[PDB]
Amino acid sequence: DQYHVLFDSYRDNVAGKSFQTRLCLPMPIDVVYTWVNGTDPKLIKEVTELKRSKFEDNEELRYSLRSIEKHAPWVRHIFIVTNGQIPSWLNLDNPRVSVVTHQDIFQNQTHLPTFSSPAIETHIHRIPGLSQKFIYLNDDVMFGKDVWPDDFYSHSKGQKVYLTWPVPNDTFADSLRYVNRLLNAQFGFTSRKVPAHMPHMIDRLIMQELQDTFPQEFDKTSSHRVRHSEDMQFAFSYFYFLMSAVQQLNISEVFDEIDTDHSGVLSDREIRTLATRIHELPLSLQDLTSLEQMLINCSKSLPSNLTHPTQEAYYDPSMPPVTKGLVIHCKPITERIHKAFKDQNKYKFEIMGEEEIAFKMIRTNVSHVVGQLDDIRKNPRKFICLNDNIDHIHKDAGTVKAVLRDFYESMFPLPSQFELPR
Amino acid sequence: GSEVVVEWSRDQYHVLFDSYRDNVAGKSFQTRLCLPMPIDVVYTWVNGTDPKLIKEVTELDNEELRYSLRSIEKHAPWVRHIFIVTNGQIPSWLNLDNPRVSVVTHQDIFQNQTHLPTFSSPAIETHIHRIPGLSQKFIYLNDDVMFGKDVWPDDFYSHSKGQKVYLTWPVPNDTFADSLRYVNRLLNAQFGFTSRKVPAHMPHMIDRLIMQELQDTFPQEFDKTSSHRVRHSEDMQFAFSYFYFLMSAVQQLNISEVFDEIDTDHSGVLSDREIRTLATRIHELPLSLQDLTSLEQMLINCSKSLPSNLTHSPTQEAYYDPSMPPVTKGLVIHCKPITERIHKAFKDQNKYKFEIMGEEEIAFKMIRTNVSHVVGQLDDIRKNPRKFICLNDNIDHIHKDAGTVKAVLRDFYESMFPLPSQFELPREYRNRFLHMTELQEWRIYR
Ligand SMILES: *[C@@H]1O[C@H](CO)[C@@H](O[C@@H]2O[C@H](CO)[C@@H](O[C@@H]3O[C@H](CO)[C@@H](O)[C@H](O[C@H]4O[C@H](CO)[C@@H](O)[C@H](O)[C@@H]4O)[C@@H]3O)[C@H](O)[C@H]2NC(C)=O)[C@H](O)[C@H]1NC(C)=O
Ligand SMILES: *[C@@H]1O[C@H](CO)[C@@H](O[C@@H]2O[C@H](CO)[C@@H](O[C@@H]3O[C@H](CO)[C@@H](O)[C@H](O)[C@@H]3O)[C@H](O)[C@H]2NC(C)=O)[C@H](O)[C@H]1NC(C)=O
Ligand SMILES: *[C@@H]1O[C@H](CO[C@@H]2O[C@@H](C)[C@@H](O)[C@@H](O)[C@@H]2O)[C@@H](O[C@@H]2O[C@H](CO)[C@@H](O)[C@H](O)[C@H]2NC(C)=O)[C@H](O)[C@H]1NC(C)=O
Ligand SMILES: *[C@@H]1O[C@H](CO[C@@H]2O[C@@H](C)[C@@H](O)[C@@H](O)[C@@H]2O)[C@@H](O)[C@H](O)[C@H]1NC(C)=O
Ligand SMILES: *[C@@H]1O[C@H](CO)[C@@H](O)[C@H](O)[C@H]1NC(C)=O
Ligand SMILES: *[C@@H]1O[C@H](CO)[C@@H](O)[C@H](O)[C@H]1NC(C)=O
Ligand SMILES: *[C@@H]1O[C@H](CO)[C@@H](O)[C@H](O)[C@H]1NC(C)=O
Ligand SMILES: *[C@@H]1O[C@H](CO)[C@@H](O)[C@H](O)[C@H]1NC(C)=O
Ligand SMILES: *[C@@H]1O[C@H](CO)[C@@H](O)[C@H](O)[C@H]1NC(C)=O
Ligand SMILES: [Ca+2]
Ligand SMILES: [Ca+2]
Incomplete structure (x- = not known):
């Protein structure tokens, strides 16, 4: 029928061969979140006990899933990686969403229970059934405009790499020096910009090559149950390995x-x-x-x-x-x-600007926060990240939270198929 | 015993139909995820040795097309159909038994038959978008243009950035400069003033609907270009008009x-x-x-x-x-x-999306008669392959090296594309008639 029409069409050329894999973007493409509930009393207790031996969000995951339904409808499946926790609102009857525990992906169970996001992000590429090219999001990252696979990857120019200039205030700056030294030791010295805070397309095969190139350092990152200065950076390591790996001509x-x-x-x-x-x-x-x-x-x-x-x-x-x-x-x-x-690049890649990324650091100046959000209202961006840096000691903290909710509800008012009927 | 089950198996056609609905929306986005198909190629070809042609003009090569068709088979295998637009002439080597290639005569596309017979490429190029059965987006080549590297539809168009536009700095020597001036005035009056570069010498992707919008915008001037049986200074430039109409057409916000x-x-x-x-x-x-x-x-x-x-409420x-x-x-x-x-x-928002491109993948060489300079030009392509190759013939036949230069070119063509294409008849065979009218009459008589 019409299925026969498409299958015949891609062979309707002088070569009589189908080029559908080249003419069409890569599919399937899954999405991976990491999610934690910081209010969980058992979690709070176990974290502090580890701290002695060695907190409510803005419902970002909920609104990020609305942004997928609205702006990335081509996504196949959504994996939410947790320690076992499940969001109350999550509709796990929906086959399109599932929860993967750290046990299901971690290689050394002794590293668990973990409280380190870099350790988790070391193993998210091991998710069973994950698409070869998937898109990883922190929950505070969401889509603010319609996106397509070509916003992450093209056949002719490879993966798009969105680079920003580092910030000295970043707590991960010690981790950047540790990774920079390993990368300089492996490929030679270059000054390196940092990948933007956004959804990152990851290729499972490339990621494993990166982790096979530095196996001890990824095992050391997985073994740190809290963030460490010598942790391998998910986005930084992957994209610079993709851009640095060389191959000799065949x-x-x-x-x-x-x-x-x-x-x-x-x-x-x-x-x-x-x-x-x-x-x-x-x-x-x-x-x-x-x-x-x-x-x-x-x-x-x-x-x-x-x-x-x-x-x-x-x-x-x-x-x-x-x-x-x-x-x-x-x-x-x-x-x-x-x-x-x-020696030439094994992989193709395209450097991109920060034009489509809207990163905002949300503090407690109400008038500044309204000014930051009004900018996104005026000039929509494909990738939005409202980084929660609110101080609960400050009095206007509750007001700022109400402003974010007002913004989130302005952009994504419709509940998604991943929220329970409620 | 007996019992039956629904079939787990899905043919690769059902596999594809199911895969494109296998998303959170349950909807197929194939039109956006895949490049536009079909995409046809259109040529213009003329045989200068034809005596009937030499006669009609006065009364008023390196077989590049052969090698250009070979470059399509090697580097653009996704092309559906290849249309060759002629005045009626049929290449001797062309294998009209292949359903992928066909010969379209100027009569089939020209609107006013009194403009025919024509001897102006700008006149013919005015109607190539009128070919019957032509794909909405097609690629127009002159026979001197070929593909020197693997090309793909995204080298001409993307869904996200629209058509790619390859612009070069104008050359004051070019004969079309008088035409460029004439077109620039009409464009200034229609879209306001912009400083405009010239599209590179290369295969050009044309959208039939956009081209028709352009010609509907300047209807008298394309009729005037068509009417000129020889090239004129007030002729509309094919690529210059289309690409600058595409980039300049505005749409009011909805x-x-x-x-x-x-x-x-x-x-x-x-x-x-x-x-x-x-x-x-x-x-x-x-x-x-x-x-x-x-x-x-x-x-x-x-x-x-x-x-x-x-x-x-x-x-x-x-x-x-x-x-x-x-x-x-x-x-x-x-x-x-x-x-x-x-x-x-x-x-005011551009009705059409476009992407300005560099000239890095275009290799335009003008072949004069200095053998050493020609061998250097061709060796540059051998050392550094380019997606789009144009070898413009400016050889002087008076010069003694002319026969040598012509031999270097055919050696370069044979070095790049030695295999005959599916569109070439075997060397021993040859089409019986060199004109469609002779072939049409002979088949009625059988
Ligand atoms: C993040 O973790 C926190 C802490 O664990 C968690 O907060 C807890 O949520 C549950 C519900 O998910 C709350 O329990 C409710 O308690 C009120 C009274 O205090 C009850 O009225 C509620 O009863 C309704 O729900 C029941 C279960 O379906 C029904 O049987 C009943 O008929 C009612 O419909 C409900 O039991 C609990 O009080 C909080 N505790 C704290 C400290 O916040 C939060 O849900 C987690 N967040 C996410 C997104 O998962
Ligand atoms: C381009 O046009 C020229 C001229 O029309 C084509 O060459 C001509 O081809 C015809 C048909 O094959 C030749 O007629 C033959 O002439 C020989 C010798 O006179 C005779 O023995 C045959 O029985 C037949 O009558 C004609 O001579 C020939 N002319 C020239 C100058 O070559 C040429 O093939 C065309 N090229 C293409 C690619 O279409
Ligand atoms: C179709 O074209 C004819 C011919 O136009 C002339 O010949 C062409 C080859 C070209 O040189 C043109 O610039 C010429 O104008 C048109 O017939 C002409 O009509 C005009 C207006 O009535 C008249 O002044 C001319 O003498 C006519 N010339 C001839 C040879 O008949 C005809 O009007 C055109 N029709 C359409 C529908 O386009
Ligand atoms: C698995 O891990 C074992 C324990 O390593 C220790 O505990 C972890 C949580 C970290 O704190 C780490 O620094 C400690 O050394 C190892 O003894 C064991 O060898 C590991 N398993 C394998 C197969 O390597
Ligand atoms: C080199 O390419 C050939 C085919 O062109 C292939 O058979 C071979 O495995 C390749 N070798 C390497 C090392 O990639
Ligand atoms: C921050 O708050 C101060 C007053 O508390 C105000 O002057 C300023 O406008 C706010 N920030 C911005 C960027 O407007
Ligand atoms: C604007 O879009 C709406 C919805 O598709 C359509 O009904 C309307 O005709 C459009 N208006 C214009 C001027 O294109
Ligand atoms: C031919 O070209 C070569 C190389 O550019 C140059 O050295 C030589 O002088 C030229 N000769 C003529 C007659 O143009
Ligand atoms: C070939 O071999 C001879 C003798 O061993 C040597 O002198 C010559 O330089 C060699 N040439 C090349 C191109 O290897
Ligand atoms: Ca409303
Ligand atoms: Ca050989």
């Missing part, structure tokens, strides 16, 4: 691009294209002859089996059939290719 | 949609909290109580002045001002002082 794939006839043997014309790849222009005759003599030299030295339909005519009658095996095993040639194309 | 965005509960009446958002949209921040009350008074005055049927809405009427959609739309400040606060 010679056999370089060969195939040169071997435009797909014969498996490089003609003189194709050898020339190889010559331009490893030599500066203009090309000299000797650049070409030296490349030729490298192939002739290598054919004699290399064993016959490694060197391996139609005979090829060469200007030099001494020229052997320039087979793939010969080019790959000819180190003088492969080394100059790698020299010409120095 | 006030009811602004209302709907502010009406976040969808109740149809703006609450006080929703009104505050509208106040920030039309006032500079910070928002003073004067700014808010001013908007509150504009709504109060309008409910009195306007007809009661235009101002128009699901829920009782409580306002800070007891004088505040229910702020309905009709009240906000008809209230001139509000909509004026709305339209002032939001500048």
Whole structure:
């Protein structure tokens, strides 16, 4: 029927092959939250006891889930990672939402019970059934305008990386120095901006490569049951590993691009294209002859089996059939290719501005808070984060909270399918 | 025994249909998640050796198209159909048995037959959007343009940023500069003055509806371009007009949609909290109580002045001002002082989205007769592949190296695309007639 129409359409091209995976954005895409209820009396008690041995929110999770229904309807499933706690309002009868406990994902149960968000965020990529590319949100992060997968990833330019300038006041600044040193030690020194406070798309395969590259440091982050100065940063480590990981060129794939006839043997014309790849222009005759003599030299030295339909005519009658095996095993040639194309990024990425991110630090100046929120009302942003820095000692703290509620209810007044009928 | 069960198995078509509804909304967003398809390619091709052609002009190559079609098979395999627009001429090598390629004659697309026969590409380019069966978004190439790297529909268009526009700095030598001047005047008069760059020499994606809107905007000038059987200084430039119409066409804001965005509960009446958002949209921040009350008074005055049927309960809405009427959609739309400040606060909005692009992926080379410079130009493409390649023929046949330069090009073409395409007849075979009219008559007679 109409299902047959779509399946036939993507093959309706000169190649007769479907390119739907390239023409369409990656799906599925799941969402992962981490959530905690700080009013839980058992939790408060167990935290302080650990502090001796070594708090109500703004219902951000609720409103963030409304922002998904409104602005990210393409999301498949929503995982809420907790210690076992479940929000009272959560409608777990809805199959689209589920709760994953720290036990379900943590590798060393002795690290649990945990009270460290970086430790949890070390294992959120281990959620069973999680989509290869998922989007991780802190509950204070939400969508303020319609978003699409292309706001996080494109096929041509890879993942989008939203970078901001660090703040010296950040408590994670010690953690940034610890991660910066590990990254400088691994890839060389660079000055690094910090990923913006926003929903982060994470690729499970890349994340595991990052954690396999620094296995002890992620285990050390997981083992700290409270935030530590030597913790690995979720967004900072991932996005800079994505941008720093290098890969060497695959010679056999370089060969195939040169071997435009797909014969498996490089003609003189194709050898020339190889010559331009490893030599500066203009090309000299000797650049070409030296490349030729490298192939002739290598054919004699290399064993016959490694060197391996139609005979090829060469200007030099001494020229052997320039087979793939010969080019790959000819180190003088492969080394100059790698020299010409120095170690290159394994992954594609696109640096982005902060234009679509609206980060506000909510203190207790009521008139300042109304001024901050009125800015979001006037100029909508795709990614909004109202960071709760309210001081309960101050008298106007309750007023500021009522202003946030007024703002949240102005933007997302409709209950979502994840709130119980109530 | 006996018992039956519903089928767990889903064909890959049901798998795809189910996957696109597998989201919190239960709705398919495939049109937004996937690039627009189908996408066709359109060429213009002419054979200069044709004696009938040489005759009609006076009375008034490197087989690049072959290699360009090879570049599509290698680098743009997603293309649905390839239309070749001719005066009637049929390439000898073209395999008209392939249903992917077809030959369209100027008669099929031109509106006034008296303009034909034509010898002006700007005239033909005026009607290529009239091809029957053409995809709404298509890619128009001259035969000298080819793909030198893997290309994809997102190299021309995205859902988020609209069509990509590749602009270059104008060249005073270019012959179309007189045409550029003529078009610039019409554009200045229609959209106001802007300084305008020229679209690069490359494949151009055209939307048939946008192109028709452009030609509906300047109907006499495209008829005048069509009427000129040879290129003229008052000819409309194909790419320059389309892309600057796309970027300049403005759309007036839809006030009811602004209302709907502010009406976040969808109740149809703006609450006080929703009104505050509208106040920030039309006032500079910070928002003073004067700014808010001013908007509150504009709504109060309008409910009195306007007809009661235009101002128009699901829920009782409580306002800070007891004088505040229910702020309905009709009240906000008809209230001139509000909509004026709305339209002032939001500048005139481009009807179409677009993305300005650099020229990095475009490799435009003008081939003269200096062999050394040509080999250097071609070696630059061999060393640094580019998505869009244009090798413009400016070779002088008088020069002795002309035959050599022509041999270097075909060597470069063969080095990049040695495999024959599905659109080429075998080398030994050849279409019997070089004109469609000869082929049409011969098949009626059989
Ligand atoms: C975060 O943790 C806090 C602390 O654990 C938690 O607050 C507690 O919530 C429960 C309900 O979720 C409260 O219990 C209520 O108590 C009142 C009287 O004090 C009762 O009237 C309520 O009864 C209703 O609900 C019952 C259960 O369905 C029904 O059987 C009954 O008929 C009524 O309909 C209810 O039992 C408890 O008092 C608070 N305690 C504190 C200290 O706040 C909070 O819910 C957690 N937040 C989230 C988002 O999960
Ligand atoms: C572009 O146009 C030219 C001219 O129309 C095409 O070449 C011409 O092709 C015709 C048909 O094959 C040739 O006619 C043949 O002539 C030979 C020798 O006179 C004769 O033995 C055959 O029986 C037939 O009559 C014609 O000679 C030839 N002319 C020239 C100058 O080459 C050419 O094929 C066209 N190219 C494309 C790509 O369509
Ligand atoms: C269709 O075109 C004819 C011809 O237009 C002329 O010839 C073209 C090749 C080109 O050179 C044009 O600039 C010419 O104007 C139109 O017939 C002309 O009509 C006008 C107005 O009645 C008259 O002054 C001319 O003498 C006519 N010329 C001829 C050759 O008939 C015709 O009106 C056009 N019709 C439509 C619907 O576009
Ligand atoms: C699992 O963890 C065990 C305990 O490690 C200790 O406790 C944790 C909570 C941290 O405080 C850590 O600093 C302590 O060293 C280890 O003894 C055990 O080896 C770990 N398991 C594995 C397989 O490594
Ligand atoms: C290199 O590419 C070829 C195919 O082009 C593939 O078979 C091979 O596994 C690749 N090798 C590496 C190391 O990626
Ligand atoms: C080839 O081998 C000879 C002898 O070992 C050596 O002198 C020459 O420099 C070599 N050339 C290349 C290109 O490897
Ligand atoms: C913060 O409060 C002070 C008075 O307490 C006021 O002057 C100021 O306007 C407020 N902040 C801003 C940014 O307006
Ligand atoms: C504005 O949008 C509404 C809702 O889709 C529609 O009914 C109305 O015709 C639109 N108005 C204009 C001028 O486009
Ligand atoms: C041809 O080009 C080369 C390289 O740019 C230059 O050195 C040479 O002088 C040119 N010769 C002529 C006749 O233009
Ligand atoms: Ca070969
Ligand atoms: Ca409302």
